[PDB]
């Protein structure tokens, strides 16, 4: 169990990695660079990249609200780079206000996502 941006000391035993000064979105881009082999070794995220590629079924759990549109596209890209070696996936967290069902319903009723207008 590896954690980026999570609490350092928890009841559950895990290997915590410190988030960068910029934020989780900056850290996510920082991490993908080591996974692509673009940055020199012996760094914090370099060990993380080594541990991810050494996988059998990899899952990156994140909340798109707190990570942001840019971070998620980067996070989803990091998974595309990871799948060149082993199988990796993302566990996109669901909102607690039925928003994900609204997307499902709006998609098959209107043909598009929510935030749709019928003025015309």
């Amino acid at each position: 169990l590896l954690s980026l941006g999570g609490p350092q000391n928890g009841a559950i035993r895990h290997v915590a990695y410190a988030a960068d000064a910029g934020g989780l979105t900056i850290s996510l881009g920082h991490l993908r660079a080591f996974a692509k082999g673009h940055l020199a070794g012996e760094a914090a995220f370099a060990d993380l990249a080594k541990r991810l590629f050494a996988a059998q079924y990899g899952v990156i759990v994140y909340d798109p609200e707190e990570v942001g549109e840019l971070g998620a596209e980067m996070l989803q890209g990091l998974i595309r780079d990871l799948n060149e070696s082993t199988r990796f996936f993302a566990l996109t967290l669901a909102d607690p206000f039925q928003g994900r069902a609204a997307v499902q319903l709006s998609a098959w009723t209107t043909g598009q996502a929510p935030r749709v207008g019928f003025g015309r």
Binding site: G37, H38, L39, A40
Partner: protein
């Protein structure tokens, strides 16, 4: 592991050179001006054997004493993969760059074991009016020359030219430096040192290469690709073999009729560059290798330490 020559870092590597077919010809004219014009047009478009037809260069300018003609001349070398491909390239170049140049005359440049037809093939442009003559030279050996009738007069061309065995090409050492303008000067005085060795030339423009020939490639059947390790625009990322102080890299490729000339040409370049290198920002000097198993001749820079 680290080596320092004249205060400038020199990598503990080797230059991977290959065995090649080589030959030399002596072209003379009534004036040294037109002797040089004839050779310059012949050596052009000859920087590598894989892409250009051959690898050509001017070994030395000859005075009217150093020549069999008695007229000012030029000793010009040509290198190729196969003795047949070398013959094919020499026939094309002598036929359309030497024969066409006014007042010229072709003689065999170097002595060697295998024979290459030269005058006996261009003689056919004479349309049956060409004649052959046999004469003993200043050393006492009987030589055969052809006389092709042309507008300016006669194009005299020796029947056969000899190709030396054991000609070595691809010997190279590259320089790492901070700025293009200054580091070019380091390489410029490096090629001037290497040119001086008899039987050795530098085929690339001015002797210097700016495109790093790398074996293999990223996609499909790449035979040659740029050397991303020594590219300054691809700095900072994993796989770049140059320090942050460096901003420009230049390569020097040497071909010679004899293997010893390749080493002596490299040695002279290695020393001349480092002596003035600090002044113009030369960071370090390395040599180009391909892995060790491609090329027979390995020129380690550790053996090039002794002063010339």
């Amino acid at each position: 592991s680290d080596f320092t020559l004249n205060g400038i870092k020199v990598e503990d590597t080797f230059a991977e050179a290959f065995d090649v077919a080589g030959t030399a010809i002596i072209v003379t004219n009534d004036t040294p001006k037109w002797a040089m014009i004839a050779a310059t047009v012949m050596t052009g478009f000859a920087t590598s054997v894989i892409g250009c037809g051959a690898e050509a260069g001017i070994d030395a300018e000859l005075s009217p004493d150093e020549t069999p003609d008695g007229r000012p001349g030029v000793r010009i070398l040509l290198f190729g993969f196969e003795p047949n491909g070398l013959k094919d390239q020499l026939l094309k170049r002598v036929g359309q760059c030497i024969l066409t140049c006014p007042g010229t005359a072709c003689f065999a440049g170097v002595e060697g074991p295998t024979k290459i037809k030269l005058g006996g093939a261009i003689r056919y442009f004479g349309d049956g009016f060409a004649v052959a003559k046999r004469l003993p030279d200043h050393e006492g050996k009987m030589r055969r020359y052809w006389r092709i009738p042309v507008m300016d007069g006669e194009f005299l061309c020796e029947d056969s030219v000899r190709a030396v065995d054991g000609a070595v090409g691809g010997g190279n050492l590259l320089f790492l430096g901070r700025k293009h303008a200054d580091t070019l000067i380091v390489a410029e005085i490096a090629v001037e040192a290497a040119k001086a060795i008899p039987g050795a030339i530098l085929p690339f423009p001015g002797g210097i290469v700016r495109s790093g020939s790398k074996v293999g490639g990223r996609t499909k059947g790449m035979m040659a690709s740029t050397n991303d390790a020594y590219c300054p625009t691809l700095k900072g990322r994993a796989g770049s073999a140059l320090p942050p102080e460096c901003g420009v890299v230049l390569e020097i490729v040497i071909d010679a009729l004899t293997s010893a000339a390749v080493a002596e040409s490299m040695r002279a370049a290695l020393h001349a560059a480092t002596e003035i290198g600090a002044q113009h920002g030369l960071v370090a000097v390395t040599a180009g290798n391909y892995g060790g198993n491609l090329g027979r001749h390995h020129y380690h820079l550790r053996d090039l330490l002794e002063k010339p």
